[PDB]
Amino acid sequence: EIPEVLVDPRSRRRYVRGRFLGKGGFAKCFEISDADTKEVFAGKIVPKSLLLKPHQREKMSMEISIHRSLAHQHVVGFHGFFEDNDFVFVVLELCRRRSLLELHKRRKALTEPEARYYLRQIVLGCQYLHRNRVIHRDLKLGNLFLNEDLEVKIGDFGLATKVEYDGERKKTLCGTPNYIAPEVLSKKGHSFEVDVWSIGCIMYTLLVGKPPFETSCLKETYLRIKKNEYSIPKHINPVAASLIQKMLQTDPTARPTINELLNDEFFTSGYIPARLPITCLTIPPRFSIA
Amino acid sequence: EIPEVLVDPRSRRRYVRGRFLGKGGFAKCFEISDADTKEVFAGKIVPKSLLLKPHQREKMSMEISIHRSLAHQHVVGFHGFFEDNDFVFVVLELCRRRSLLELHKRRKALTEPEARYYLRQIVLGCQYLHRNRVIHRDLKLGNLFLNEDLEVKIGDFGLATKVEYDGERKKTLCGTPNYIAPEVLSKKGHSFEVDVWSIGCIMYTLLVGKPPFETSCLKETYLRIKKNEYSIPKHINPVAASLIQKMLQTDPTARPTINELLNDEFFTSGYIPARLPITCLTIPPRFSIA
Numbered sequence: 178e179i180p181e182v183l184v185d186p187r188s189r190r191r192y193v194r195g196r197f198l199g200k201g202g203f204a205k206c207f208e209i210s211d212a213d214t215k216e217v218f219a220g221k222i223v224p225k226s227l228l229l230k231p232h233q234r235e236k237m238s239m240e241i242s243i244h245r246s247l248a249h250q251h252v253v254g255f256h257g258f259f260e261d262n263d264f265v266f267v268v269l270e271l272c273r274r275r276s277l278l279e280l281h282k283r284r285k286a287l288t289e290p291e292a293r294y295y296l297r298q299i300v301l302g303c304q305y306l307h308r309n310r311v312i313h314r315d316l317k318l319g320n321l322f323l324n325e326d327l328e329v330k331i332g333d334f335g336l337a338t339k340v341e342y343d344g345e346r347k348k349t350l351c352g353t354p355n356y357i358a359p360e361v362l363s364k365k366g367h368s369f370e371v372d373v374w375s376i377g378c379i380m381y382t383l384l385v386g387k388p389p390f391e392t393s394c395l396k397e398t399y400l401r402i403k404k405n406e407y408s409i410p411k412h413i414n415p416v417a418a419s420l421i422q423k424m425l426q427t428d429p430t431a432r433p434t435i436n437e438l439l440n441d442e443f444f445t446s447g448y449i450p451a452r453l454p455i456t457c458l459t460i461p462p463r464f465s466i467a
Numbered sequence: 468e469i470p471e472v473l474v475d476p477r478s479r480r481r482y483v484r485g486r487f488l489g490k491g492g493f494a495k496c497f498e499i500s501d502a503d504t505k506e507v508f509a510g511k512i513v514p515k516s517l518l519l520k521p522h523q524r525e526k527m528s529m530e531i532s533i534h535r536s537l538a539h540q541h542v543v544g545f546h547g548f549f550e551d552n553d554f555v556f557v558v559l560e561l562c563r564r565r566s567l568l569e570l571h572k573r574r575k576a577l578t579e580p581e582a583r584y585y586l587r588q589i590v591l592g593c594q595y596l597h598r599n600r601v602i603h604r605d606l607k608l609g610n611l612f613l614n615e616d617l618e619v620k621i622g623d624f625g626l627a628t629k630v631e632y633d634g635e636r637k638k639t640l641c642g643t644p645n646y647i648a649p650e651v652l653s654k655k656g657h658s659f660e661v662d663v664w665s666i667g668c669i670m671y672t673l674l675v676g677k678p679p680f681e682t683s684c685l686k687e688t689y690l691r692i693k694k695n696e697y698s699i700p701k702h703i704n705p706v707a708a709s710l711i712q713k714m715l716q717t718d719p720t721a722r723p724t725i726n727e728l729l730n731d732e733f734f735t736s737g738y739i740p741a742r743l744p745i746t747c748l749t750i751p752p753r754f755s756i757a
């Protein structure tokens with residue numbers, strides 16, 4: 178039922194709707210372009226018909242509120258929002274190379290240098306978020322978008338929350354994140370540490386080629402996370418394996434903090450590419466010297 | 468994509484598909500009738516296109532396996548199943564008066580006698596299930612169907628499980644039941660007691676007109692159940708209020724067992740109608756003497 182042109186009274190700007198990119202939650206995303214400046218964007222379009230309950234509205238509202246307040250090289254740029262009477266429209270930075278999920282589907286396990294490269298950017302993005310007292314709470318591969326340079330941009334703040342005062346422990350998380358931290362499952366209160374947990378799973382998945390706690394039943398997976406049941410393959414280098422372990426610990430107080438991470442031996446003693454070639458979307462790089 | 472006639476090779480029987488009744492989970496339900504004996508049935512029709520994963524298949528399979536093994540006045544009769552290459556078909560006892568959910572929407576709080584009447588039947592149905600080592604695990608209003616006589620028939624065994632040996636504690640429940648017991652949320656293992664818990668909520672809802680632990684966020688509701696946060700209105704009779712309390716306790720070992728229930732003062736000292744008039748679908752009964 179979505180209009181072909183998206184008009185924002187108050188900004189003046191108009192947007193031609195273009196190609197579908199996908200659908201997550203109540204949203205559909207489209208390439209759109211500022212009919213004037215011809216600049217291209219990702220547009221996230223939620224029908225108000227799925228927002229009849231105040232609780233669902235507040236969530237949509239809270240996502241815009243958090244996302245709007247953020248600007249950083251490795252966070253998906255927020256360029257505005259508006260609504261007509263049937264839709265909410267959110268205009269976001271377009272990432273022309275999809276997400277780490279599609280990369281991982283095509284390459285499974287990456288080379289260490291690739292993993293250093295992406296994890297660094299994920300971590301810088303997340304250092305920014307924690308610095309601003311935002312927990313993302315659903316960092317996973319399909320939320321980690323890639324622009325035309327294969328730079329990471331964290332996106333989808335629909336489960337993100339704001340830490341409102343020191344020592345606050347979030348008691349609930351309304352949603353079912355992918356790489357979900359143990360203290361969320363055991364409802365003991367959670368904070369910034371759940372993100373470091375998710376990055377631990379991401380690091381495992383990037384290095385190993387599969388998620389750490391996969392099973393066929395989601396409820397078994399939860400159980401595994403609860404008991405910290407996972408094993409790191411023997412071929413994963415020990416420095417890398419060490420860092421995975423540090424992050425994937427049941428005790429949130431035990432895990433490194435987002436700022437500790439880039440000082441880990443894993444980064445500081447390994448080669449970190451300055452940039453990757455597009456070939457690496459499909460072909461493992463050998464990082465040859467000349 | 469569903470055929471207009473449902474044919475079961477092996478039984479011979481054919482069924483004309485008829486009116487939609489509703490849709491829960493992967494299923495759609497239709498009135499159907501044995502094209503020969505003209506007998507009418509409820510048909511539950513699941514598309515194999517939503518059953519591609521082995522885990523989803525096993526659940527469908529487990530529901531038929533449990534439901535098929537059951538016969539009782541207050542359980543929805545199982546009359547067979549079959550499949551073609553695109554659908555599973557399950558032929559069930561038709562309940563022409565929908566469920567306690569539609570009754571509750573129309574009447575909110577019932578009179579005590581009505582509540583005794585329905586709870587008795589729910590309990591007899593459930594005594595049968597426990598006798599056969601089946602936990603239902605999602606007893607709620609929309610699962611409690613009513614035939615043309617306003618007799619209760621427990622239905623939907625899609626979260627039901629079989630207790631395989633004495634003292635077994637089910638560790639997981641793959642699904643999100645409505646009136647969900649605390650020990651399921653705190654993953655401590657659960658057994659027959661979760662059903663008595665659900666009947667406690669049903670009793671509260673039938674007497675009070677709203678569920679005991681309602682909030683606007685499901686995750687807040689869980690939290691409330693976890694801490695046993697609910698209050699019984701002062702006008703609910705004390706005997707009734709007592710029985711609600713006995714059933715809605717955090718400690719599963721503390722709650723009555725399905726067989727203790729009908730001996731409770733709530734039943735044995737109150738008037739229990741032998742039957743209700745259809746008027747009570749819409750009009751509160753006064754149970755006058757002549």
Ligand SMILES: CN1CCN(c2ccc(OC(F)(F)F)c(Nc3ncc4c(n3)-c3c(c(C(N)=O)nn3CCO)CC4)c2)CC1
Pocket residue numbers: 198199200201204206219221253269270271272273274275276278279319320322332333334
């Ligand atoms: C899981 N996969 C699905 C497909 N993906 C995919 C596929 C194509 C894309 O565009 C281009 F072709 F230019 F590369 C892009 N690029 C792209 N760029 C910016 C955004 C999105 N996608 C996006 C967002 C959300 C959200 N929830 O907030 N979902 N999607 C994406 C809609 O899902 C936020 C803004 C991503 C990446 C994520």
Ligand SMILES: CN1CCN(c2ccc(OC(F)(F)F)c(Nc3ncc4c(n3)-c3c(c(C(N)=O)nn3CCO)CC4)c2)CC1
Pocket residue numbers: 488489490491494496509511543559560561562563564565566568569609610612622623624
């Ligand atoms: C939540 N409400 C929805 C509407 N209901 C409703 C409405 C109309 C009905 O038929 C008649 F008109 F004759 F009364 C009936 N009667 C009816 N009778 C037998 C069955 C069902 N419905 C049924 C089942 C399931 C399941 N999951 O296993 N879902 N539905 C029902 C499909 O949802 C199992 C077998 C129920 C009762 C439950």
Ligand SMILES: [Zn+2]
Pocket residue numbers: 393394395396397522641
């Ligand atoms: Zn499961």
Ligand SMILES: [Zn+2]
Pocket residue numbers: 232351683684685686687
């Ligand atoms: Zn919620």
